[PDB]
């Protein structure tokens with residue numbers, strides 16, 4: 001696709017963009033977001049100042065630029081980003097805006113070093129990259145269980161731990177969504193479009209929340225941890241909104257189930273390769289959904305439930321989990337309270353799970369980082385390790 005003249009330039013100018021990453025990406029958001037202010041209905045301003053989004057330009061540009069020789073090596077991450085982008089209603093028309101400001105950023109930072117051929121080459125590289133995304137995302141759009149945001153009604157609010165509530169939600173009249181006959185794969189998340197009233201907030205806020213169950217008869221269920229303030233910065237915007245302000249009976253807007261996180265359907269129906277469900281904190285949520293599937297499809301499979309939380313009180317889904325585990329032939333229930341016990345290490349996973357195992361893991365950015373490292377050392381095949389981070393996945397690879 002991209003030419004070697006214009007491909008050489010790209011390789012040759014990665015050292016500058018890698019070194020000037022933070023500045024460019026800061027310039028990019030400052031400009032783009034104060035020109036197109038409506039975009040603040042999509043981008044979460046807090047991502048830039050907290051998690052993995054200060055080097056995100058330099059994450060997604062260094063990745064591209066470094067892999068410019070062969071872009072297909074990133075295809076897995078593109079597909080995962082895709083689910084998020086479609087979930088978030090990112091459309092072909094958004095892409096040029098990004099590209100336009102990406103070049104404008106570089107020009108501002110590099111000055112006369114960013115020559116017309118340098119700019120040109122990136123302009124080119126960009127559309128090539130964007131074209132892969134638009135195409136991946138188009139297929140996802142035509143395959144979603146329903147188009148865009150649709151109004152749902154909050155039919156129940158229940159604490160399933162001291163600071164995690166579970167919302168059960170039902171589609172409103174004329175949303176055109178019949179609850180039963182919505183095929184959900186356990187491990188998919190939905191995405192909400194809220195508009196918080198606190199903290200001087202003026203725009204929409206979009207967040208993915210993993211479904212607790214693939215069963216839809218009584219509504220869709222998701223569970224939200226309260227990201228509190230404590231002694232430092234402010235509370236998480238939507239988690240506080242949901243917890244404090246979303247009342248049962250209120251409307252909420254959701255987009256269709258997204259995501260790649262799913263258990264291996266071939267290994268469900270056998271008893272030789274055990275299923276390992278490895279979770280921290282609210283991360284337990286898609287795993288609960290996955291557990292419910294295994295228990296219902298085949299309860300003879302060996303299951304290892306490895307749930308970590310701070311407390312018994314902060315331990316999510318105690319009733320729910322017990323009840324499902326009671327139904328299986330051979331389980332090992334492993335509950336880690338980090339107020340009493342050490343964090344999960346490789347040593348721990350060796351002793352507590354089998355050497356050959358079909359493993360699924362979920363929780364914070366940091367919990368993933370750790371778990372993937374541990375399982376790699378114990379030499380679990382990559383095919384056997386699967387994970388879904390509760391932040392940006394482009395920063396939980398390499």
Ligand SMILES: Cc1cc2nc3c(=O)[nH]c(=O)nc-3n(C[C@H](O)[C@H](O)[C@H](O)COP(=O)(O)OP(=O)(O)OC[C@H]3O[C@@H](n4cnc5c(N)ncnc54)[C@H](O)[C@@H]3O)c2cc1C
Pocket residue numbers: 044046047049050189205207208209210211222223224225226227228229233234235236237238239240282285286388389390391392
């Ligand atoms: C695929 C996927 C599935 C997910 N599933 C779930 C789920 O089932 N349940 C769930 O609870 N979450 C889930 N998450 C995480 C969730 O979507 C949100 O990321 C989460 O609710 C936080 O949103 P927030 O608006 O409340 O916090 P934000 O306002 O987005 O801020 C995030 C964090 O930054 C901190 N912060 C705020 N300001 C600053 C600052 N200035 N400096 C440093 N730190 C700051 C806040 O305290 C907060 O902890 C999932 C995420 C993904 C990607």
Ligand code: HEM
Pocket residue numbers: 042043044045047060080081084085088090094095096097098129130133391392393394395
């Ligand atoms: C080829 C160009 C693009 C690339 C490489 C890219 C890459 C990424 C990556 C890596 C993430 C993090 C998701 C995760 O880790 O799970 C992300 C999320 C996101 N993308 Fe893109 N994206 C592109 C285009 C766009 C466009 C055109 C828009 C709209 C203007 C957009 C809006 C968003 C939003 C809103 C998020 C998450 C929410 C946030 O960051 O606040 N992206 N993208």
Ligand SMILES: Clc1ccc(CO[C@H](Cn2ccnc2)c2ccc(Cl)cc2Cl)cc1
Pocket residue numbers: 024025028055056057058060061064098101102105125126129
């Ligand atoms: Cl080749 C390429 C172009 C754009 C992007 C990622 O686009 C991000 C914004 N973003 C983040 C999430 N969704 C969109 C971005 C563009 C430009 C700059 Cl300078 C910084 C960033 Cl962070 C990735 C590779």
